[PDB]
Amino acid sequence: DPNRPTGAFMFLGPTGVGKTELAKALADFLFDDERAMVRIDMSEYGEKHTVARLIGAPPGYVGYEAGGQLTEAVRRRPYTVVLFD
Amino acid sequence: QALQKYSTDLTARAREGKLDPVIGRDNEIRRVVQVLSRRTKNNPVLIGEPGVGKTAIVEGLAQRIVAGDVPESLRDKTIVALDLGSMVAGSKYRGEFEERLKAVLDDIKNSAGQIITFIDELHTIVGAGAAGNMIKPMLARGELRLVGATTLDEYRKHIEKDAALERRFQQVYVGEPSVEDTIGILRGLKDRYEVHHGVRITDSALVAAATLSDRYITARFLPDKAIDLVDEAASRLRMEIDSRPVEIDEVERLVRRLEIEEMALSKEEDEASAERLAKLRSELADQKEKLAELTTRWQNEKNAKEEVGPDDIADVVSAWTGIPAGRLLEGETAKLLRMEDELGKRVIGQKAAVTAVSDAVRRSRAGVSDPNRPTGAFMFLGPTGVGKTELAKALADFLFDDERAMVRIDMSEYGEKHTVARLIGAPPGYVGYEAGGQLTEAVRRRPYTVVLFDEIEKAHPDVFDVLLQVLDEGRLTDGHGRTVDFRNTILILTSNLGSGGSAEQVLAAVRATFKPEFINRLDDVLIFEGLNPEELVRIVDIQLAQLGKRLAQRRLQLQVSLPAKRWLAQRGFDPVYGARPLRRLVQQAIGDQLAKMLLAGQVHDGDTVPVNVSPDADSL
Amino acid sequence: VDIQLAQLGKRLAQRRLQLQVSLPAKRWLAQRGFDPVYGARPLRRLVQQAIGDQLAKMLLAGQVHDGDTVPVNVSPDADSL
Amino acid sequence: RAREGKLDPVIGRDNEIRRVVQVLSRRTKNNPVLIGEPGVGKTAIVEGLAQRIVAGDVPESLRDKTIVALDLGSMVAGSKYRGEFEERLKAVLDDIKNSAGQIITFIDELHTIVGAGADAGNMIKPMLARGELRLVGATTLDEYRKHIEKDAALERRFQQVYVGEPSVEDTIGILRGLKDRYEVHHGVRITDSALVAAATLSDRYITARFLPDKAIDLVDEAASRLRMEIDSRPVEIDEVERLVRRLE
Amino acid sequence: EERLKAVLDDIKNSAGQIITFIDELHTIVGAGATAMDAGNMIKPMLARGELRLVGATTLDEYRKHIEKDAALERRFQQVYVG
Ligand SMILES: Nc1ncnc2c1ncn2[C@@H]1O[C@H](COP(=O)(O)OP(=O)(O)OP(O)(O)=S)[C@@H](O)[C@H]1O
Ligand SMILES: Nc1ncnc2c1ncn2[C@@H]1O[C@H](COP(=O)(O)OP(=O)(O)OP(O)(O)=S)[C@@H](O)[C@H]1O
Ligand SMILES: Nc1ncnc2c1ncn2[C@@H]1O[C@H](COP(=O)(O)OP(=O)(O)OP(O)(O)=S)[C@@H](O)[C@H]1O
Ligand SMILES: Nc1ncnc2c1ncn2[C@@H]1O[C@H](COP(=O)(O)OP(=O)(O)OP(O)(O)=S)[C@@H](O)[C@H]1O
């Protein structure tokens, strides 16, 4: 489908099985360096007002030129895999 | 002539070999060229994070044109580089800056297709008026070539706000090279630093200065975060091959200073300092000995280095960043084998935990532990007052020689969700934003410290999920977006879980209070035992020595009897409160009588009071 | 276990100290850390604690200097280098 | 200033000064920046290096070089017109480059270099990365990450030098060296048993401030008070008289 | 900055006589803003003790305005008035 991510799905299960090594292995053979994966952790986003952490803050506030954290990585060079820890 | 006046040539500089070799990066140079020789929109702009090489690419294009390695319509172009600073200077009248810009633009127009205007820090054109906008008409006519270079974020901070401009440029992405390409660039740049100084540079050095500045300095980018080590090691070696090498230039300046001290301290008409002089002489002599020995060894080496080897780079990586990554110069390897007996001078028993704490330090000095994970992170737990916080302070002193130099946070205050922003900073645009985090901003600089979380189970089980990505991955991101790395710290968690069960209750309570994916990340989860009646005499003498050192500021050293020590280690023992009862007993028994005897005269300074056993109390 | 040992060799190939592990050794390892409640991380923990501990004990006590290859073998309980 | 003997003796801190030297004497990007908490001694290091040059302990690449103390405040003094400040700074930069490296510009409180604009403190960015002007700067630890680290294009041209605070044993020596400069200004004498106490005592009572600075104040205040007592009557004979002349 | 430099120069030209006195000196921090430049031009002269500057501020506008500037608090000695 041309209007949807090229793939978006979830795996889950017990710990120490490989549900992270699998994503790392995937990012390693498409970009040839494992550093080229966007990895954000959803354990720091336990508050409501942390939605503006990966979106940026509105104009006229303190942290404004800093831009987002998830959007500013996919705006420039969108081809990666984004991991939602 | 205005071009002769304001800007400065670049090809003229390239012709005289004033620029450096530009090894690699041919793809981007070809891309620049094919964008530069297009029909419309012939304005490339270089975009990338600082240090990756962006002026280097224009220097390379200059070398290429001068040598003659370009396609047809790029022969003898004479790249020119503007200078807005000198353009707006002394133009204190109303129509001068725009006039000078007019003259420059006309002189660029007259040359049909030769000149290539080149602006570095392109973003500095958006202002410059009081203007700086009399360029959109020209770009609309393709008259200007305007090769430009800026960084990734000043772009959207000063240009993307003016999308009438951002249309007229084509972005070229400049990603940082890998370690191989870094080795390549260094293998070509070596020759010029070998000439500036007078030293030799092995190839193992050009390998290390890239593979090392990639694991440690995680804040800059490859092509220069790897050159700076070499350019420092060269200068250090030059200094050494000149007047006396270092490690003699320290003991000389130290022996001299100790001498200047002792030859003016002796003439103190006092008795208090008479014991502060009976040690200065001792250490001055013990260092004179070492200076003599080393200066003699210098003769053996001179009769029986001259290039920056592979470990001078490591010495620079250690002087920077504080992290010790050296070669274990034969004096440390003795400390690393006496580690256990040196800790045992401050902690007693719990050897099953001492062996585990210590083994994870030699395991990283020998370069055997995993390079992307903390240096070792494990949790202590056991009954109260047993040693499980004294051990962390004894370990943080064996490594830095000052107990106060560990980052320590008390987890008995992080009792709610929102108190996580206490150690991570605040999200963008809020009250405390210029202050950053509290755990972060002390491990973002000097990342060799030791992290201590007391009473981890007193927290709220959502602080536990920051340490998830702290452990077993070694990094976390504060509010500002920066990513600090914990790949060299030693995390330590203390607790008091169970405290009543032999060995099953503690594990059951741990499994009930923590997550499996949290107990699975740590190294061994040690258990402390609990002191035995035998193991308290070795604490009694410790406490008495400490107290004597305290009341040694008035020369009032005690003189304790062996029956006294045995009574003292038999009275306070109860096996439910650990070893604090012993301290309170020492106070209540000795210090009270001593303080009542001290301020009631009769124990004036310079005295040595003995203590001895009376039937129940112990009289002085 | 094979992937772990290969990565470990590639790591301590920076001092040219290639290793030599036996099939009974790899079987002893793959049998030791298996418990089906934590997954595979206990394997990395055991690898470190059982090999790297001894190796780093010796490496700074001389006798295992660069350019060398030390073999491992199963002993009754541990596996001596 | 260091030639005429106008600077205080600098003691210890060998490693910091040797690293300042071996950074200040490289091919490109030869400009250090001292960093660390306020009070631990960061202008003391530059003054020590200057006295060291005047004496001649420095290597050949630095023998006979003068250190000039740039003053950014006195440059924006009168510059109300649209280009005068840029003209001034350009003349200064051209004159620095006109010499052959016989000058080492030293900017104190360099976090103030970001402004001056209204495109300022930015025309220095080319000459920095080439090593023309040798810059020695020193700002505290937390205005760095507030004004400089926000501008990763400019903080790339700086090599950080961390300056940790000394210990009690070292502070004792620093005081042993500095005593004879207060012994003169105040007409008094200072006892070594007091120099040890002003450093052991000011390490468990005043925790809001850092080392030597929080240990030199005690010595200086004690001497000034003793001189006051020397001139007039002693204390506890002065207040008893002041309140008596009031109860009357 | 011109006026500030003039006043500082005329304080320095005197033989250490003048004893300046800034009442409620918690207003000296952001003297002239635009980018930190002004109000800390006196920071080199405080250390050498050229100008004396006895000042006085309330107890909770000293940790709301100054203590946030730990580099400048260092040059001041506190006299607690109970
Ligand atoms: N099938 C597997 N393939 C590759 N590596 C594996 C596999 N199973 C386990 N591992 C390794 O064991 C560790 C498990 O890594 P992870 O994938 O993060 O664990 P996990 O399965 O994600 O469990 P959690 O919930 O994330 S703690 C890593 O060191 C992996 O390399
Ligand atoms: N391919 C290369 N060949 C030779 N030197 C290089 C190469 N890439 C980078 N360098 C060096 O690395 C440094 C990069 O300098 P510049 O490219 O001018 O800085 P930049 O990459 O433009 O980023 P900024 O924003 O200008 S600091 C210089 O010392 C270059 O000589
Ligand atoms: N093995 C020991 N060796 C030396 N001193 C010890 C030892 N165990 C306890 N102490 C003394 O006990 C005090 C420190 O006890 P801690 O271990 O810090 O208490 P704790 O282990 O943190 O237990 P809790 O539950 O955290 S109060 C100091 O006075 C030490 O001198
Ligand atoms: N190594 C040293 N030897 C002698 N005196 C020293 C030494 N270090 C510091 N001092 C003295 O202690 C004081 C420290 O003041 P400075 O170092 O000039 O201030 P600072 O350390 O630069 O802090 P900031 O950041 O400038 S506010 C001065 O009186 C110095 O003379």
Swiss-Prot record, chain D:
The chain holds residues 171 to 424 of 848 of the full protein. Homohexamer. The oligomerization is ATP-dependent. The keyword Repeat applies. This is Chaperone protein ClpB. GO terms for molecular function: ATP binding; ATP hydrolysis activity. It comes from Mycobacterium tuberculosis (strain CDC 1551 / Oshkosh). Belongs to the ClpA/ClpB family. GO terms for biological process: cellular response to heat; protein refolding. The keyword Disulfide bond does not apply. It is found in: Cytoplasm. Part of a stress-induced multi-chaperone system, it is involved in the recovery of the cell from heat-induced damage, in cooperation with DnaK, DnaJ and GrpE. Acts before DnaK, in the processing of protein aggregates. Protein binding stimulates the ATPase activity; ATP hydrolysis unfolds the denatured protein aggregates, which probably helps expose new hydrophobic binding sites on the surface of ClpB-bound aggregates, contributing to the solubilization and refolding of denatured protein aggregates by DnaK. The Clp repeat (R) domain probably functions as a substrate-discriminating domain, recruiting aggregated proteins to the ClpB hexamer and/or stabilizing bound proteins. The NBD2 domain is responsible for oligomerization, whereas the NBD1 domain stabilizes the hexamer probably in an ATP-dependent manner. The movement of the coiled-coil domain is essential for ClpB ability to rescue proteins from an aggregated state, probably by pulling apart large aggregated proteins, which are bound between the coiled-coils motifs of adjacent ClpB subunits in the functional hexamer. ATP 1 binds at G36, E37, P38, G39, V40, G41, K42, T43. It comes from the Bacteria. GO terms for cellular component: cytoplasm. Keywords: ATP-binding, Chaperone, Coiled coil, Cytoplasm, Nucleotide-binding, Repeat, Stress response. Residues 1-165 are annotated as: NBD1.
UniProtKB/Swiss-Prot annotation, chain E:
Belongs to the ClpA/ClpB family. Part of a stress-induced multi-chaperone system, it is involved in the recovery of the cell from heat-induced damage, in cooperation with DnaK, DnaJ and GrpE. Acts before DnaK, in the processing of protein aggregates. Protein binding stimulates the ATPase activity; ATP hydrolysis unfolds the denatured protein aggregates, which probably helps expose new hydrophobic binding sites on the surface of ClpB-bound aggregates, contributing to the solubilization and refolding of denatured protein aggregates by DnaK. This is Chaperone protein ClpB. It is found in: Cytoplasm. The chain holds residues 256 to 340 of 848 of the full protein. Homohexamer. The oligomerization is ATP-dependent. The Clp repeat (R) domain probably functions as a substrate-discriminating domain, recruiting aggregated proteins to the ClpB hexamer and/or stabilizing bound proteins. The NBD2 domain is responsible for oligomerization, whereas the NBD1 domain stabilizes the hexamer probably in an ATP-dependent manner. The movement of the coiled-coil domain is essential for ClpB ability to rescue proteins from an aggregated state, probably by pulling apart large aggregated proteins, which are bound between the coiled-coils motifs of adjacent ClpB subunits in the functional hexamer. It comes from the Bacteria.
